[PDB]
Coordinates of C-alpha atoms and ligand atoms in Angstrom, one line a residue:
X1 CA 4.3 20.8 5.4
X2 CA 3.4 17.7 3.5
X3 CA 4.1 18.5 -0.8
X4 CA 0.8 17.5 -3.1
X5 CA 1.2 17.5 -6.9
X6 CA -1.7 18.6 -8.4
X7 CA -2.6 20.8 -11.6
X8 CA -5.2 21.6 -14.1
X9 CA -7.1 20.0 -17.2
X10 CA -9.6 20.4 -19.2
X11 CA -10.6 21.9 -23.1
X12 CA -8.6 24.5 -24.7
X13 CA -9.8 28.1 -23.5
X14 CA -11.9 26.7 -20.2
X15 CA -9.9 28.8 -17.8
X16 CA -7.0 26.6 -17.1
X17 CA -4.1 29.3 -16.4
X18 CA -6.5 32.2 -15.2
X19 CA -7.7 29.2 -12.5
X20 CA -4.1 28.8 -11.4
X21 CA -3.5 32.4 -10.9
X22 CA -7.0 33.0 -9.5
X23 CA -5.3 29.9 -6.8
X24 CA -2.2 31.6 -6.1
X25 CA -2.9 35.0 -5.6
X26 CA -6.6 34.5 -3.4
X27 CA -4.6 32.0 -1.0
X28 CA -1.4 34.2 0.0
X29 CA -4.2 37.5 -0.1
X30 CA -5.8 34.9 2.6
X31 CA -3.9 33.1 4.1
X32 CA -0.7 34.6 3.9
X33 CA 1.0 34.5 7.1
X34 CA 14.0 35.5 -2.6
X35 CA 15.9 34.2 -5.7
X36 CA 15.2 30.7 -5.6
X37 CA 12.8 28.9 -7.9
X38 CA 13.3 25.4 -8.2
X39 CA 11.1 23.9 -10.3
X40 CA 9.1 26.7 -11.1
X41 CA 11.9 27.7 -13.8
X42 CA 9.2 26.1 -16.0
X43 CA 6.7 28.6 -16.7
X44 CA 3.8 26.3 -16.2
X45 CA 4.6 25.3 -12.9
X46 CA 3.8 27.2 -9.7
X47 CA 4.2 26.6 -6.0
X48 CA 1.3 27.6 -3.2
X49 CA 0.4 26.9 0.3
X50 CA -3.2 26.4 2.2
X51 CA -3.0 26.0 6.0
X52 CA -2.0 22.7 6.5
X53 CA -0.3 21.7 3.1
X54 CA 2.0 23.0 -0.2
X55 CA 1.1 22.1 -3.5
X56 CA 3.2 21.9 -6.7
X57 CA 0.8 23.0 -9.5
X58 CA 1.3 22.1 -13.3
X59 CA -0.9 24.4 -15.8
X60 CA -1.3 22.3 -18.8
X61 CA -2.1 23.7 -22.2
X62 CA -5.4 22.0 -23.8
X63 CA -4.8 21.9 -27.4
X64 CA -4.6 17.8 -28.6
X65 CA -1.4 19.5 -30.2
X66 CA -0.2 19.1 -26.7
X67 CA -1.3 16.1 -25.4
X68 CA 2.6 14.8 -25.2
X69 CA 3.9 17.7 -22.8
X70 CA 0.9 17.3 -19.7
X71 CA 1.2 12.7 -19.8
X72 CA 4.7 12.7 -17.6
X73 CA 3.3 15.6 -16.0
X74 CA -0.3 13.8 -15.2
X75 CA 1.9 10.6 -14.5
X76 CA 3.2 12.5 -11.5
X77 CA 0.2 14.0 -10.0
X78 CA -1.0 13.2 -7.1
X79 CA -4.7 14.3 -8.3
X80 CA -5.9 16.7 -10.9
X81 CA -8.0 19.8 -10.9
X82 CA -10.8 19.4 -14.0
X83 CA -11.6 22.7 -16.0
X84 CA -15.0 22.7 -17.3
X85 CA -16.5 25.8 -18.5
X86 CA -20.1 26.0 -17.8
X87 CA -20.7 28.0 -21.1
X88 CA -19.5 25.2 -23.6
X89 CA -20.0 22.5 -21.0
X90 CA -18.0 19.1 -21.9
X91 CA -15.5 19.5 -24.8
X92 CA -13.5 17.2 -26.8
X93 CA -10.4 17.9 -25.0
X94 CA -12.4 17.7 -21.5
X95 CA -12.7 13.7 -22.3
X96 CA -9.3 13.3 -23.9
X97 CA -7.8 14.6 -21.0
X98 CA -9.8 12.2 -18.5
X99 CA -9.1 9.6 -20.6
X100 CA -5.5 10.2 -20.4
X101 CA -6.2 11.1 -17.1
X102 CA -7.3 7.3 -16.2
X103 CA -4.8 6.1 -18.6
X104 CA -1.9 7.3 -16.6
X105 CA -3.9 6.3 -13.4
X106 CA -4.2 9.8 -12.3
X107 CA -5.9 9.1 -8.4
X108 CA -8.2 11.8 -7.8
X109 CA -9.9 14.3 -10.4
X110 CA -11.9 17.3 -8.7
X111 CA -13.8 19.4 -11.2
X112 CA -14.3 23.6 -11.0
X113 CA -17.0 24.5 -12.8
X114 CA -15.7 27.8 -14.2
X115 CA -17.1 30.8 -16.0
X116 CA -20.3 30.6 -13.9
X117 CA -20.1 34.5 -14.1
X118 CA -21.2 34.1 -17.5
X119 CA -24.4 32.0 -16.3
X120 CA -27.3 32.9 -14.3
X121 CA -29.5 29.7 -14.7
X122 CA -29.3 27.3 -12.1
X123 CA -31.1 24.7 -14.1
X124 CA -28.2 25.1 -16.4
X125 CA -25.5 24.6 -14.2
X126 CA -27.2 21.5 -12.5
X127 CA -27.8 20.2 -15.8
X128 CA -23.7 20.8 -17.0
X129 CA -22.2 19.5 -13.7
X130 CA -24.9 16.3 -14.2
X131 CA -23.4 15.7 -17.7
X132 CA -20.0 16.4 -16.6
X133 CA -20.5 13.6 -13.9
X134 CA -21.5 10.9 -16.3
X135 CA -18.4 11.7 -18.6
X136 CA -16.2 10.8 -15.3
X137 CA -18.4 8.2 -14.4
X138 CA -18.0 7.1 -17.8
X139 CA -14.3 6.8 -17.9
X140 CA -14.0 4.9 -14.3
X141 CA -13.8 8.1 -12.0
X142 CA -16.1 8.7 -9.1
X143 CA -18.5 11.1 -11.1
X144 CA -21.1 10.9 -7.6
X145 CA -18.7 11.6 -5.5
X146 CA -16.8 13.9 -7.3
X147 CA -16.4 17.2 -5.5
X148 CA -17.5 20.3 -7.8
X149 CA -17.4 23.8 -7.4
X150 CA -18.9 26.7 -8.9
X151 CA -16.8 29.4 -9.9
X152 CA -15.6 32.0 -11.9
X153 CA -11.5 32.0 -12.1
X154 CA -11.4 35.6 -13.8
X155 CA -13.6 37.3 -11.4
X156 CA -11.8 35.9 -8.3
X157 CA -8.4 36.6 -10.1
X158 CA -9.9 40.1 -10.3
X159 CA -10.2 40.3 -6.4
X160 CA -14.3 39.9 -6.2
X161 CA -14.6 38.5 -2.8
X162 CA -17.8 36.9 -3.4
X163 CA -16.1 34.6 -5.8
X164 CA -13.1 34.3 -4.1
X165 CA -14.5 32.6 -1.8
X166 CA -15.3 29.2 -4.4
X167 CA -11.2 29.5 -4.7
X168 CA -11.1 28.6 -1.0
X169 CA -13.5 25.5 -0.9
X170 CA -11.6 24.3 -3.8
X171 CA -8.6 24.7 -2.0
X172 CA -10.5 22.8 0.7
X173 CA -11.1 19.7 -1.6
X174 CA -7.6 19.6 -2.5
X175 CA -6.7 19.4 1.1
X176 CA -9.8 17.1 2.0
X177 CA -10.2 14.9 -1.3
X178 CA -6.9 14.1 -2.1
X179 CA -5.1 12.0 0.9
X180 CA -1.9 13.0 1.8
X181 CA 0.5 11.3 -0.1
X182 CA 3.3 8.2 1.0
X183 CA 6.5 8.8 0.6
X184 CA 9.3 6.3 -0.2
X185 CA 11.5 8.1 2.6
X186 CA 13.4 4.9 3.6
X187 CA 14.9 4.0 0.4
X188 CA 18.0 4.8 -1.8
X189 CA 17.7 8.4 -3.1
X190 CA 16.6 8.7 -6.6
X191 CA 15.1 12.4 -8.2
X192 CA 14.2 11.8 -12.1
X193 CA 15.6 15.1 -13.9
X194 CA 12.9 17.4 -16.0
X195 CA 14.8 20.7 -16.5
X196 CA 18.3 21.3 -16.4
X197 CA 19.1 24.8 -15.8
X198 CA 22.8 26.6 -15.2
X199 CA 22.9 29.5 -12.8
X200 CA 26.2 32.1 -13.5
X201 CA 28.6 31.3 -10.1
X202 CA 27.1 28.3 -9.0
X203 CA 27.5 25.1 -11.8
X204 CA 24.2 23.3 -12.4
X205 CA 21.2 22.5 -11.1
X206 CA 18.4 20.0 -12.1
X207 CA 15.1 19.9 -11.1
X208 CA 12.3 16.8 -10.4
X209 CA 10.4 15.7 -7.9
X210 CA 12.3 13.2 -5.6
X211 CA 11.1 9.7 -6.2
X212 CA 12.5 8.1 -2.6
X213 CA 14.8 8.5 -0.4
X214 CA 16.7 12.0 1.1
X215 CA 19.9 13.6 -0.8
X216 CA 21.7 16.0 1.7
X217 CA 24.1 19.1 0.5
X218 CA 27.6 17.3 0.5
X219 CA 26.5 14.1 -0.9
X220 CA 27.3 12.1 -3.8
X221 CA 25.2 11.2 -6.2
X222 CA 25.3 9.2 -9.7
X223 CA 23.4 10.5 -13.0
X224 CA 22.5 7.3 -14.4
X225 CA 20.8 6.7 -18.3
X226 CA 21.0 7.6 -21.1
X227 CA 24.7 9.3 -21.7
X228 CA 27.6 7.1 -19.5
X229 CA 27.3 7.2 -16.0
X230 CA 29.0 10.3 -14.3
X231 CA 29.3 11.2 -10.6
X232 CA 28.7 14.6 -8.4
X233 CA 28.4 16.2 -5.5
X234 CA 25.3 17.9 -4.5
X235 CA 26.2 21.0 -3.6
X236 CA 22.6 22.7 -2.2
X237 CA 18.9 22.1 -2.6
X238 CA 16.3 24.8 -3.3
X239 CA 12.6 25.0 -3.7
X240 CA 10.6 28.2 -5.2
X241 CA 11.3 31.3 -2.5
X242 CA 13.9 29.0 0.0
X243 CA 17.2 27.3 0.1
X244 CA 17.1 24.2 2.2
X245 CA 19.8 21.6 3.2
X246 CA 18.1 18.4 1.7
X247 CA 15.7 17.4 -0.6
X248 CA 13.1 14.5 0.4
X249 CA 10.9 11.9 -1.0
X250 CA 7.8 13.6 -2.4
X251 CA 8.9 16.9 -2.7
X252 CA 10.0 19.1 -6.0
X253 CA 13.0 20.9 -5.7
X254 CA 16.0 21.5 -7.4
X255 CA 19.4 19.9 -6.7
X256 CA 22.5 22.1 -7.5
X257 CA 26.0 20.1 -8.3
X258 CA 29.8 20.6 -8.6
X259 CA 31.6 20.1 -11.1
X260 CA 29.4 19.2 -14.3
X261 CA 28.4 21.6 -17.4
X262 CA 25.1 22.3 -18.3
X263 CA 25.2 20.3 -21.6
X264 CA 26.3 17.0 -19.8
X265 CA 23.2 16.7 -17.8
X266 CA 19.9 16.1 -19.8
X267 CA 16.0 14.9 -19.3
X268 CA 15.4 11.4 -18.4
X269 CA 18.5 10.5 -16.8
X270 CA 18.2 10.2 -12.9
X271 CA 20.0 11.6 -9.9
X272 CA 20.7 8.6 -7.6
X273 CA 22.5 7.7 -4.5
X274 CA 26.5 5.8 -5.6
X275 CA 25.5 1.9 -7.1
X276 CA 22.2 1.7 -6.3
X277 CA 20.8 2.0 -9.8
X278 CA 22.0 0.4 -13.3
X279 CA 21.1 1.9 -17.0
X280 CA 19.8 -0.8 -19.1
X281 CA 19.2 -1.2 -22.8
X282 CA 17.2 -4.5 -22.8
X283 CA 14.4 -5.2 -20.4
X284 CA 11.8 -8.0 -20.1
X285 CA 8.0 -7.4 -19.3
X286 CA 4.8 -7.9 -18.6
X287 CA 2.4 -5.5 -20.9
X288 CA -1.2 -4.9 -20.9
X289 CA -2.3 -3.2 -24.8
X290 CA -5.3 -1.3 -24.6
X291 CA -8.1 -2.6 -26.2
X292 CA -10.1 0.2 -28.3
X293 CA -12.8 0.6 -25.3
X294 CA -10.1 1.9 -23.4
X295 CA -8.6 4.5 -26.6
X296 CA -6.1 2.0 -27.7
X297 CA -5.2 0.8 -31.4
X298 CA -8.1 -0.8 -33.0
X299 CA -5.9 -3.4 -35.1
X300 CA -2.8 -5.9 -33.8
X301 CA 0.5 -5.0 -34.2
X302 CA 3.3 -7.6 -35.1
X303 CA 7.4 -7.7 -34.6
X304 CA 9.4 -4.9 -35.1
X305 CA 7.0 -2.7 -34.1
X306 CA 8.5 0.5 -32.8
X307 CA 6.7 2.6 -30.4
X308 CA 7.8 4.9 -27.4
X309 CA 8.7 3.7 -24.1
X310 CA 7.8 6.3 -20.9
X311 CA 9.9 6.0 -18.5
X312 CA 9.7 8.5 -15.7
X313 CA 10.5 12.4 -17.4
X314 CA 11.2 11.0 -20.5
X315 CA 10.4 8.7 -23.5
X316 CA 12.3 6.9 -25.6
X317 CA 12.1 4.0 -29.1
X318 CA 12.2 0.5 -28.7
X319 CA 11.9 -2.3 -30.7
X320 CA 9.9 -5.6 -29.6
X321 CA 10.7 -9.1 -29.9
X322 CA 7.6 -11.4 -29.3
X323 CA 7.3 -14.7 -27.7
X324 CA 7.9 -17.6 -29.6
X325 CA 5.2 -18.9 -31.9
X326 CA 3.4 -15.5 -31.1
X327 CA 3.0 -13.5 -34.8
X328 CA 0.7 -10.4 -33.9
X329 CA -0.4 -8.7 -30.7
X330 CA -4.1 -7.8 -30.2
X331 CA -5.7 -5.0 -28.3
X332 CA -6.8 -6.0 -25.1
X333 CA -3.6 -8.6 -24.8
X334 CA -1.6 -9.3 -21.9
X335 CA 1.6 -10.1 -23.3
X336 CA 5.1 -10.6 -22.2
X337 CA 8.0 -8.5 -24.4
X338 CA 11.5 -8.4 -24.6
X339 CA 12.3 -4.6 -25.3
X340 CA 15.5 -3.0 -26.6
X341 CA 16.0 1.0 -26.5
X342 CA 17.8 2.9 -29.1
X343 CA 19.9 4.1 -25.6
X344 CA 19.9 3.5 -21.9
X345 CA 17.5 4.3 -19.1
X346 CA 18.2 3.8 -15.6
X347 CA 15.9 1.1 -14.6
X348 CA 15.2 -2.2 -12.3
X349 CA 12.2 -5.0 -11.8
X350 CA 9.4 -3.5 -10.9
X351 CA 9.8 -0.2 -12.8
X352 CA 6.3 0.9 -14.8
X353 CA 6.0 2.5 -18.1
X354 CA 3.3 3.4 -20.7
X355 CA 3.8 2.9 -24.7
X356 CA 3.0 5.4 -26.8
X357 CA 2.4 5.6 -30.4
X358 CA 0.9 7.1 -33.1
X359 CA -0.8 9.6 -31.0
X360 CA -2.5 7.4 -28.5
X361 CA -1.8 5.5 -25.7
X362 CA -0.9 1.7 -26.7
X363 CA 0.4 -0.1 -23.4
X364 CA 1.1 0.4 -19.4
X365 CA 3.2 -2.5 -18.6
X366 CA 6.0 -2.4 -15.9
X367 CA 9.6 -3.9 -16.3
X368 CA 10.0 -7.6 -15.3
X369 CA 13.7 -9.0 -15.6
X370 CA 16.5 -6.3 -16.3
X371 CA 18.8 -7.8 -19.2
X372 CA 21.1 -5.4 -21.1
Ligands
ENX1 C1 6.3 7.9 -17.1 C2 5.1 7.2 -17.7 C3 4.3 6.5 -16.6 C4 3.1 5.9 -16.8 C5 2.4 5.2 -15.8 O1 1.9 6.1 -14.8 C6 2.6 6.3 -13.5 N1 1.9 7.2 -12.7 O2 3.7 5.8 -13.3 C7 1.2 4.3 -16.3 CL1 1.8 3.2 -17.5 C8 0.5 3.6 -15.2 O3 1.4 2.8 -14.4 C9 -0.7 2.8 -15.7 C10 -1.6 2.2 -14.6 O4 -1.4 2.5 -13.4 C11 -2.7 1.2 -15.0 O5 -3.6 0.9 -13.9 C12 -3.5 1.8 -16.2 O6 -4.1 2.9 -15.7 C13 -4.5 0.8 -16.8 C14 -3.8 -0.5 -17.3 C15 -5.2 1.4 -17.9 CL2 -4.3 1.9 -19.3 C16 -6.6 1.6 -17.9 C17 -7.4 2.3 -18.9 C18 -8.7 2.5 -18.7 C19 -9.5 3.1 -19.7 C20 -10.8 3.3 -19.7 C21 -11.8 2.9 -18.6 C22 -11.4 4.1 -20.8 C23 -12.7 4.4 -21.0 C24 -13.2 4.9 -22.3 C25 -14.5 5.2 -22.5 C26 -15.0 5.8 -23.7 O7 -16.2 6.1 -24.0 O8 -14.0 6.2 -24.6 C27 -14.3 6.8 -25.9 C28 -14.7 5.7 -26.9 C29 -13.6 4.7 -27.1 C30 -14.0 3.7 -28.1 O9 -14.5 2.6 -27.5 O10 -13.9 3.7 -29.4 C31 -12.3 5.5 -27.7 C32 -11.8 6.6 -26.7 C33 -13.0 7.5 -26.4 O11 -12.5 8.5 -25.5
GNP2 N1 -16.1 35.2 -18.1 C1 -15.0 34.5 -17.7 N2 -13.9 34.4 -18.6 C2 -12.9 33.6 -18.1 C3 -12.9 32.9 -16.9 N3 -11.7 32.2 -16.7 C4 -11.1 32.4 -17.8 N4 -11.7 33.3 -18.7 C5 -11.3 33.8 -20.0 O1 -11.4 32.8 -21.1 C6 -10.1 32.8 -21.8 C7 -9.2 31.6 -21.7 O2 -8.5 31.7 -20.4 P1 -7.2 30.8 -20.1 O3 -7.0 30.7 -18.6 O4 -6.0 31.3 -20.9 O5 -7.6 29.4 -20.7 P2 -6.8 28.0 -20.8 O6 -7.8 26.9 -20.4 O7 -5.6 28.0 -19.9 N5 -6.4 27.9 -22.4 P3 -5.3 26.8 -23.1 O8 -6.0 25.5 -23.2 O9 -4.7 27.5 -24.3 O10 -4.2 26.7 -22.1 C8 -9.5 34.2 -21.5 O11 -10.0 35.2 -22.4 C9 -10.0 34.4 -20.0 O12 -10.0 35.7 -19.6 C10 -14.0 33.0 -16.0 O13 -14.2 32.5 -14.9 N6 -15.1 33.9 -16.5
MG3 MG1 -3.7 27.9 -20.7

């Protein structure tokens, strides 16, 4: 069964979580036919099968307070469900998190109108789904083409079959709308580590998504970043309700290993197959800054400036040394940066990365010569 990342969006209070309960309980009372959770130790992520496909699903909280916790979870989706409640209709959290949404270079966005239990006019809805069309369109997403249903999470949670049945054709546009997925199958294994959990008998197991490549029980690996390089063994691979024997490229699991303590294992290092990958300190790079049309910072920034560097699960400070002659950086600049952490991260060319700072997104760039 091909794995598809998705998960919900949208303003604080829209129906997010009821949406992703309303998901997992009408598609196994539909279409269904243990002690292992995987990555589903994290309370806002949940597992769930339609016909043909399983999806990992990441119910993201919509308070601006937040904004941190849902980017290296948006960064990893494969497309995004859009909350909009057709009460309020567009809020100011429904365009931060499309913006963020583009920002990252989330793929696909599908919208559910929600709430629409609440609503009787269907001048009203056709007038909220038009709005909600030019937002997208507004931020570069496909607001004509964008699939949108009409719904009402709470009363489909509550087993009304009438609106149960807008659950299933959403489930149908994740399956149809969102193309199945490549996978880096062929490569050297590499899993970037969210949570790190320790299970009483068994030593430790972390959880991600597996970038590339396969890792098989018995196997080395390395954890490389941050602390000094250490070598395991993995000792089994799990995913929520099964054990399994390996863990492949595109699917979330969790990886148990031998012989290493809880606290020596933490977010942002990388599970990776013996020498393959380095940790570096210094990095060069090619960075685009956002100008202000795209939510970036409206003024330039000069040396020394110290924002944070996304890399994979985790983010971290860096300092920047400009080109020579160059005194200030201007949004809407292409630039190329020589970058130095306060600590490693496992890295190599090629490798992308957003800046963060302030609040706000500053830069996407992507690592060009590996120096440290
Ligand atoms: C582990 C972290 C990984 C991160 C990476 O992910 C992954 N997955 O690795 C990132 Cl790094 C990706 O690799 C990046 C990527 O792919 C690139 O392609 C980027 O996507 C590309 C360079 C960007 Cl950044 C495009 C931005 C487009 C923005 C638009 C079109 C905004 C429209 C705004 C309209 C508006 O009206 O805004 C109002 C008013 C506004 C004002 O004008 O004032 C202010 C804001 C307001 O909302
Ligand atoms: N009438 C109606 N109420 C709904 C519907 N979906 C959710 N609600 C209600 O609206 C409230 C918010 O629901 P909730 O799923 O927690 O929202 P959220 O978007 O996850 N909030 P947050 O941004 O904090 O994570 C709850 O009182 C819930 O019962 C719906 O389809 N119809
Ligand atoms: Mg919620």
């Amino acid at each position: 069964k091909p794995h598809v990342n998705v998960g919900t969006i949208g303003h604080v209070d829209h129906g997010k979580t009821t949406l992703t309960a309303a998901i997992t309980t009408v598609l196994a009372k539909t279409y269904g036919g243990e002690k292992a959770r995987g990555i589903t130790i994290n309370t806002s992520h949940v597992e769930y099968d339609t016909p043909t496909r399983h999806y990992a699903h990441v119910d993201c909280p919509g308070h601006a307070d937040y904004v941190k916790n849902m980017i290296t979870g948006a960064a990893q989706m494969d497309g995004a469900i859009l909350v909009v409640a057709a009460t309020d209709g567009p809020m100011p959290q429904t365009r931060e998190h499309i913006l963020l949404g583009r920002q990252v270079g989330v793929p696909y966005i599908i919208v559910f109108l929600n709430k629409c239990d609440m609503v009787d006019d269907e001048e009203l809805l056709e007038l909220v789904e038009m709005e909600v069309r030019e937002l997208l369109s507004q931020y570069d997403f496909p607001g004509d083409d964008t699939p949108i249903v009409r719904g009402s999470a709470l009363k489909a949670l509550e087993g009304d079959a009438e609106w149960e049945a807008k659950i299933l054709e959403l489930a149908g546009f994740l399956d149809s709308y969102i193309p199945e997925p490549e996978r880096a199958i062929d490569k050297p294994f590499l899993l970037p580590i969210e949570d790190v959990f320790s299970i009483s008998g068994r030593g430790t197991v972390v959880t991600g998504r597996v970038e590339r490549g396969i890792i098989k029980v018995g196997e080395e690996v390395e954890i490389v970043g941050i602390k000094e390089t250490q070598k395991s063994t993995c000792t089994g691979v799990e995913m929520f309700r099964k054990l399994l024997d390996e863990g492949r490229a595109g699917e979330n699991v969790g990886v148990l290993l031998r012989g290493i303590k809880r606290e020596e294992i933490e977010r942002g290092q990388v599970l990776a197959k013996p020498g393959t990958i380095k940790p570096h300190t210094k990095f060069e790079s090619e960075v685009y800054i956002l100008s202000k049309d795209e939510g970036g910072r409206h003024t330039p920034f000069f040396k020394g400036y110290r924002p944070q560097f996304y890399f994979r699960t985790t983010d971290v400070t860096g300092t920047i040394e400009l080109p020579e002659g160059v005194e200030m950086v201007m949004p809407g600049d292409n630039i190329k940066m020589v970058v130095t952490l306060i600590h490693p991260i496992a890295m190599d060319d090629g490798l992308r990365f957003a800046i963060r700072e302030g609040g706000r997104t500053v830069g996407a760039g992507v690592v060009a010569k590996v120096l440290s």
